[PDB]
Structure 1
Amino acid sequence: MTFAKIKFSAQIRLETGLHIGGSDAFAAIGAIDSPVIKDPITNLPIIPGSSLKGKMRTLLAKVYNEKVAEKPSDDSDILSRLFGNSKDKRFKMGRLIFRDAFLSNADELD
């Protein structure tokens, strides 16, 4: 009925390290390694909300579907209702908004 917004706030702690990826646009002159995605200003590693949303949708698609799901637009009611669906007028805008995750314990790490 009434409008509300619930903000799930958590801290993602890396048990092992994380290679999100991206291309060599912030790669150092001389580095041949595969770079991780970085903030254009602080050059700290980030976790883009696109990767979180994609992996969460792919994982939940093996549990809450009981179908084939050839394409993302074919997902069930329970998943297209949250994560959005481009081929359904009732679920074009999903109820879940992900946000880019930025470093917070840089001081502690130092």
Structure 2
Amino acid sequence: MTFAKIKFSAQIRLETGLHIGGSDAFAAIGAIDSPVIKDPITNLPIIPGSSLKGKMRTLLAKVYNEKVAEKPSDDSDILSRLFGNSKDKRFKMGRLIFRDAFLSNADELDSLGVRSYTEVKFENTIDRITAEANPRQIERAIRNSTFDFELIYEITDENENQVEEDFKVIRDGLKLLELDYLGGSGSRGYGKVAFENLKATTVFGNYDVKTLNELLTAEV
């Protein structure tokens, strides 16, 4: 199948508060919380593509390897094919490109009457012997935020069957992330997220996306 690029686009909607990244650089003077990864220029939360790729890959290893997979070098050819493998000559360059996702709906939220685009959640832990409480604050990207999502798939030397299987793997990946969380304090209910208006477009070359679009909207 002669070269082509299919662009998977969606909006990530945060169903619960999300917390990813950041450091004491991006920090506000007198912030006491664990801050979030932010776009430096707008100081808005951003969902780093590194995160999305990471989580989707490690979840997909549980499904698609049927192997121990001690290090990502050891993943199956089907995952290495998509996410890339540094130690295999064939897969040194991967067919997927994840993109930093940026907040769309700031205006929607400003309308809904938010006084910031990030919430700081107070939590604590209560000692079970002494009953003493130790509190903690942590920043989260606010609930019902949306982020414009882009993932790029490259058809080069993979003729007929392989593109189909790859599409299956991408849909399985996203669904698995929907049935999991985007890295945060996930066990305590963070990072639940949903892919809205998930849609395929051929942005280079010639390919038929009718079948895929059907399979995306319903089956993911």
TM-score interval, normalised by the smaller of the two chains: over 0.9
Map of 1:1-110 to 2, 5 A cutoff? 1-110=1-110
Residues of 2 paired with 1:109 and 1:76: CA distance? 42
The secondary structure found in structure 2 opposite 1:102 is: strand
SS class of match (1:13): strand
Q: By how many angstroms is 1:16 displaced? A: 0.3
Q: CA deviation at 1:2?
A: 0.8
Q: Supply the distance in 1 between the matched residues of 2:24 and 2:34 (Cα, whole angstroms).
A: 8
1:21 Cα deviation from its structure 2 partner = 1.7
Shift of 1:14: 0.1
1: distance between equivalents of 2:57 and 2:96? 11
After TM superposition, give the deviation of residue 31 of structure 1 in Å.
0.7
- 2:24, 2:109 → 1: CA distance? 25
Aligned-residue offset at 1:24: 1.6
TM-score (norm 1): 0.98
| Offset of residue 32 of structure 1 | 1.1
SS of match in other structure, 2:5: coil
Quote the Cα distance in structure 2 between the aligned partners of 1:21 and 1:40. 13
Give the superposition deviation at 1:8. 0.1
The alignment partner of 2:4 has SS state of: coil
Other structure's SS at 1:58 match? helix
Whichever structure has more strand as a proportion of its residues is 2
Q: Distance between the aligned counterparts of 2:76 and 2:22, measured in 1?
A: 30
| Distance of 1:62 and 1:24 partners within structure 2 | 34
Structure 2: 5+ residue runs without aligned partners? Answer: 111-220
Aligned-residue identity in percent: 100
Higher relative contact order (CA 8 A, sep 6+): 2
In the alignment, the residues of structure 2 paired with residue 26 and residue 68 of structure 1 have an alpha-carbon distance, to the nearest angstrom, of 38
**In terms of Rg, which structure is larger?**
2
CA RMSD in angstroms, aligned pairs only: 0.6
Distance 1:99 1:15 in 2: 20
> What is the deviation of 1:22?
1.8
Cα distance, 1:26 vs structure 2: 1.2
Following TM superposition, by how much is the alpha carbon of 1:25 offset from its aligned partner in structure 2, in angstroms?
1.0
Structure ranking higher in helix proportion? 2
**SS at 1:63 equivalent:** helix
TM-score by length of 2: 0.49
Matched residue count: 110
